[PDB]
Design a protein around this ligand. Sequence first.
Ligand SMILES: *C(=O)[C@H](CC)[C@H]1NC(C(=O)O)=C2[C@H]1CCC[C@H]2OCCCC
Length: 359
Amino acid sequence: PVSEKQLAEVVANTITPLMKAQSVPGMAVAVIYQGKPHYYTFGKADIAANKPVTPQTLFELGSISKTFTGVLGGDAIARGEISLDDAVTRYWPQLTGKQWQGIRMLDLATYTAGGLPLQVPDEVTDNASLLRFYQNWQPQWKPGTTRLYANASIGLFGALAVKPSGMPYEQAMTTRVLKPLKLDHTWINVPKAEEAHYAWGYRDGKAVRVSPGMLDAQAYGVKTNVQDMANWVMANMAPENVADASLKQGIALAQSRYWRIGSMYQGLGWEMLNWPVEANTVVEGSDSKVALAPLPVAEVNPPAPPVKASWVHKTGSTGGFGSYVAFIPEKQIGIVMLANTSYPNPARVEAAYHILEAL
Ligand SMILES: *C(=O)[C@H](CC)[C@H]1NC(C(=O)O)=C2[C@H]1CCC[C@H]2OCCCC
């Protein structure tokens, strides 16, 4: 058993060098090991005001928000309000274009709909334009044949996953996910009384923050501190300890394997690789050329339930932040790395892989 001291050094001697080389002003880390999380804070949350990163510091999660969208979706499935097999059209009858027919809620949740673009275009400001956008979309591939990572796919899935509930996305997430897990410092919209905890992002010397856009709460809009995030990782890492029954199942469903893409497996928001896995295959699958490419898929039908020996992770960014989380259920270890600079993902996973490998 690694002492608290050794682990502190291990995190120290990995993150500082990582912050120097990538000139990251601030980052907070945890470190889930032996039932408890362990926090480490470095640098600044705001250079201009010289406020150091604290365990209360709020960070933009970026694409890591998709993991919440994934679990919230699984929760609706657990309650029976929705089914992955249903036609997307079943929750958006207005979507009449014949090209949507054999497309499922599953395809949306897993970027397998046939080439939905990485982003929902900027001309899309309201409901009428969201409709027109999707209504005009012409698929490059048949459903369930190609994985093309997109915010416009999963963004839609989350907004449609909550319709039967009659609850707006923000309200459904706080009620069914955030509140039952005691994540009271995680928000889709930071309340005025917490702005003070809100860190500033840092693009090339410039202080920045995410902007509002359609289907954002679902794909890249969530903010939290390292404590809430560590508990969000503890819940996803050990759902047995989750009392709420539907939420317990929603978590398992998000970690379930729906498609094999080379060495990777696609869940609801989460992505997985069998453990043991070498750092080289996780670091290289992390490169833009791989992560943005539309790759041929292999259906895991029926969906494989959570496999403990999995390296389960998710990377996320906004203009000014960079975050990464990874956990191995079989070994009850996990890591949260929140930084206020969007550095390269391959650099995030190597550092994460390095500290976990020590545990
Ligand atoms: C998840 O981290 C996102 C989703 C919004 C990643 N996808 C893209 C994109 O669709 O362009 C990103 C990237 C994170 C960084 C933000 C965004 O890049 C746009 C450029 C503005 C920084």
